[PDB]
Design a protein around this nucleic acid. Structure first.
Lengths: 232, 61, 507, 61
DNA sequence: AATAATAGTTTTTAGTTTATTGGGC
DNA sequence: GCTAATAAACTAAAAACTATTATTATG
């Protein structure tokens, strides 16, 4: 299970990206079997093999109920391993490949589940929120940016805090290099701004954050920033 | 625990002896039990070994 | 790594090698082939990862892809396998010798340049890194290609050539009436840094014994067990190599393999929800320990942070006289540390200075040691071991510091020991006399594990399909009758001196 | 072992001879049926209230 | 459009399991 | 009559020591 296996995973992934509901149904059997081989708790697989998460990140079918009935189990496993990952107490806030894999998985699976209905929503918001330093074009922050952007709505009512910090972190990330990171930050930006505008419009407290947060920085915008500010 | 035995010397002498591991390594005398995360019990927690067919198959051997 | 080993074996396929001075003696063919069996068995025991080959010459056939006549390759440079051994055994002995001579030619003219060509090509084929371009052959003649001056010239030219390419060759003396005529034709053609110009050696005179002897050791390469750092003052930190000169042995892993295929089965073992028959999750795992009433629940990173005390490293605790440790404060087998300059350069200078000083000081280096992550630290003493040499100036002891381990208070288990009892000096003299009777000069390498050796015997006899497993000889059995004759009546003399003659030491 | 005071006196004489001659005894130890017999070194340990020998395992080649 | 940081290779190594005399009346 | 150490064999477990290569720079 190596570059051969990894390339095979990439192949079937791009297949499912192309193929949509012609023979996308002999997957539930396969879905169960990848859950089982992932339920092989042996640490034998390499971190690169953890791209298996993108494998289980699924959108090529209607995802019959059993897919959902196991998806939350997958989610909980990923949350636990993330709790392990960020704890720099293991000397590692590290998860070299894991982050993007679980990002893609939750991207494809949150489409079916997990609107704002509970604390777990805020929990996953937080695990994303911890997003210190990276290396080699800094893929993990971009992964987090895309993940949030696709499901910004499922994060409402818990983005109403730290907005100053979230905002400035977004600004620096798009200001940073690796234009892929820039555009990921852009997308996350617009998703966040739309969502916060929506929540503010329906508030009764809109005035507080309104007059305390926006026109000052909007004036202060005066490269690409202005254009975003224009939308803002 | 002592080692009551008889040291044999050559072919005609034997000495009853009592050995003792006076110096010893340090290891915990209480093992760690991995119970369930919900029942908090290990009874539902037991292993299933599979010797999946080493050929192009997965049947347990 | 620093390279691997390469070696090929060559045999003169001629009637002069199937004969003997007296035919009761083995033919050079037969002794050579059994020595090859021995060598391959030693490799399989020790370093079967190396690559081994066999080729013929003088036979009236050739199998080399070069297709030069009489140059018949037998095997390419391959790891020693039992199949190869059987291929050798079918013609080993002076009946398989005849069978070989039937199915295979034997005895013909050729030039040594051909065999040198084919062996050079075989070396060139393998893409790996070989630290030794060793060449082995078996013959006891130097004349047939010195017979033709052109053949001698080309052979020596190619010999110098392969020496230029760093190829090494060696020949064992084979049993001849006349011999290979030392320095007549092989004193420059052979890459030698030694001298044995004392006899044409018509008789065999070589290291064949060691070649036919079988060592039972793995002799793994030299690896840095660790390059871990010393935290001298938490500012000055040194890089040093970690090694042991001795490692407790083991047994090869039991390869579980399927019945009617002999194929090792890929095996996956996992836990599952026994309450429902479902399959568990790594999150489902909850670490627990019951004490009296409450069972206490902990996690993995919790289980390691309690094991986490400090970074992997060495923390110098101070100086302590070497005499301030008694050998009965022994712990797991001692280790050794060598200086290194991989990151901390100049640190070897410090190591030498401190070695010399504490040798003059006659004190040990007490340190606090954490091997690895999430490992508690322990008290460790560093005795300065001096580089000890011999007549050949070989490091019978290398320089550096032997690493010994300090048992803790809990490590002590004070027995319910009784009082102290003396003895008469005449009994002490009896004991001194008996000791001098059975005095034995110590020698470390004079012993092996009989279980290890016998399990080997089983293993290689199994692969070799022997008429019996080899009867491994236990060096640890004391020759009881030898001590009886070496002592005489001193045994019973001291027995009646101490033991009441009516009272046997048996209850 | 206890109740063999003759063996106790013999062991004491052994210890005294080892001290005087600076000998150390090379011995073969076999813990039980299923423990591998092996070689170790035995040297005396002396305290005011007890004299004893100390066994330390030794390696092979 | 080049160089670079990063993979398990074995190899030890350190918990586990067992089948082992032992205190009991 | 009950059931406790126990070293042996057996697991996983991390580092050495690999060899490989996405990188940025730059045209």
């Amino acid at each position: 299970c190596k570059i051969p296996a990894l390339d095979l995973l990439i192949k079937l992934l791009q297949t499912f990206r192309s193929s949509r509901l012609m023979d996308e149904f002999k997957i539930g059997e396969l879905f169960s079997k990848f859950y089982g081989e992932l339920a092989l708790k042996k640490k034998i697989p390499d971190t690169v093999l953890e791209k298996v998460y993108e494998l289980l990140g699924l959108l090529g079918e209607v995802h019959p109920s059993e897919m959902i009935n196991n998806a939350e189990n997958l989610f909980r496993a990923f949350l636990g391993e993330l709790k392990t990952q960020m704890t720099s107490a293991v000397r590692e806030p590290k998860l070299p490949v894991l982050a993007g894999c679980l990002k893609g998985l939750s991207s494809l699976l949150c489409n079916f589940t997990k609107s704002m209905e509970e604390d777990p929503q805020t929990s996953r918001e937080i695990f994303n929120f911890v997003l210190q330093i990276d290396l080699k074009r800094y893929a993990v922050p971009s992964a987090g940016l895309r993940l949030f952007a696709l499901h910004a709505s499922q994060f409402s009512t818990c983005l109403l805090d730290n907005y100053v910090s979230l905002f400035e972190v977004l600004l620096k990330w798009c200001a940073h290099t690796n234009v892929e990171l820039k555009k990921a930050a852009l997308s996350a930006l617009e998703s966040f701004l739309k969502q916060v505008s929506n929540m503010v419009a329906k508030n009764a407290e809109m005035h507080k954050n309104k007059l305390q947060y926006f026109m000052e920085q909007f004036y202060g915008i005066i490269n690409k920033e202005l254009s975003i500010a224009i939308r803002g | 625990i002592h080692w009551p035995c008889r040291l044999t010397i050559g072919s005609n002498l034997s000495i009853r002896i009592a050995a003792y591991k006076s110096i010893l390594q340090e290891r915990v005398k209480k093992t760690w039990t991995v119970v369930d995360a919900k029942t908090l019990k290990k009874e539902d927690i037991q292993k299933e070994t599979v010797y999946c067919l080493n050929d192009d198959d997965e049947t347990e051997v | 790594y620093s390279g691997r080993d390469s070696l090929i074996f060559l045999v003169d396929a001629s009637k002069a090698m199937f004969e003997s001075q007296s035919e009761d003696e083995l033919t050079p063919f037969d002794m050579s082939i059994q020595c090859i069996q021995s060598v391959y068995i030693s490799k399989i025991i020790s370093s079967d990862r190396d690559l081994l080959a066999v080729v013929f010459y003088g036979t009236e056939k050739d199998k080399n892809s070069v297709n030069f006549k009489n140059i018949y390759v037998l095997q390419e440079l391959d790891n020693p396998g039992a199949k190869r051994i059987l291929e050798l055994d079918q013609f080993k002995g002076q009946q398989g010798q005849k069978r070989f001579q039937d199915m295979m030619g034997h005895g013909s003219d050729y030039s040594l340049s051909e065999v040198l060509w084919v062996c050079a090509n075989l070396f060139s084929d393998v893409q790996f890194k070989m630290s030794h371009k060793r060449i082995m052959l078996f013959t006891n003649e130097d004349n047939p290609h010195g017979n033709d001056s052109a053949k001698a010239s080309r052979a020596r030219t190619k010999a110098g050539d392969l020496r230029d390419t760093g190829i090494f060759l060696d020949l064992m003396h084979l049993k001849k009436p006349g011999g290979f005529d030392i320095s007549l034709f092989y004193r420059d053609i052979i890459s030698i840094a030694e001298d044995e110009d004392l006899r044409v050696h018509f008789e065999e005179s070589s290291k064949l014994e060691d070649l036919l002897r079988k060592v039972r050791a793995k002799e793994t390469r030299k690896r840095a067990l660790s390059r871990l750092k010393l935290k001298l003052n938490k500012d000055i930190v040194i890089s040093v190599g970690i090694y042991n000169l001795v490692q407790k042995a083991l047994k090869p892993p039991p390869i579980k393999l399927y019945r009617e295929t002999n194929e090792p089965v890929k095996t996956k073992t996992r836990t599952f929800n026994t309450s429902t028959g479902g399959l568990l999750l790594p999150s489902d795992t909850k670490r627990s320990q019951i004490y009296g009433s409450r069972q206490i629940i902990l996690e993995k990173e919790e289980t390691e942070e309690l094991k986490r005390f400090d970074d992997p490293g060495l923390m110098l605790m101070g100086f302590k006289p070497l005499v301030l440790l008694k050998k009965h404060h022994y712990l797991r087998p001692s280790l050794f540390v060598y200086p290194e300059e991989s990151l901390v350069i100049g640190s070897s200078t410090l190591f030498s200075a401190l070695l010399i000083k504490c040798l003059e000081k006659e004190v040990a280096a007490l340190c606090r040691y954490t091997p690895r992550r999430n490992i508690p630290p322990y008290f460790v003493a560093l005795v300065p071991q001096e580089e000890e040499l011999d007549d050949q100036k070989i490091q019978v002891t290398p320089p550096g510091f032997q690493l010994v381990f300090l048992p803790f208070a809990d490590d002590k288990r004070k027995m319910p020991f009784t009082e102290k009892i003396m003895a008469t000096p005449e009994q002490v003299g009896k004991m001194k006399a008996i000791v001098e009777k059975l005095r034995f000069t110590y020698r470390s390498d004079s012993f092996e594990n009989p279980v290890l050796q016998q399990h080997f015997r089983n293993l290689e006899a199994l692969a070799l399909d022997l008429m019996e497993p080899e009867q491994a000889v236990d060096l640890t059995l004391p020759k009881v009758e030898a001590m009886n004759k070496r002592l005489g009546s001193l045994v019973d003399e001291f027995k009646e001196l101490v033991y009441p003659p009516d009272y046997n030491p048996e209850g | 072992a206890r109740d063999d005071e003759a063996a106790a006196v013999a062991l004491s004489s052994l210890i005294h001879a080892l001290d005087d001659l600076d000998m150390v005894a090379i011995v073969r130890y076999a813990y039980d049926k299923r423990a591998n017999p092996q070689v170790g070194v035995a040297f005396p340990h002396i305290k005011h209230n007890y004299e004893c020998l100390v066994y330390v395992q030794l390696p092979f080649m």
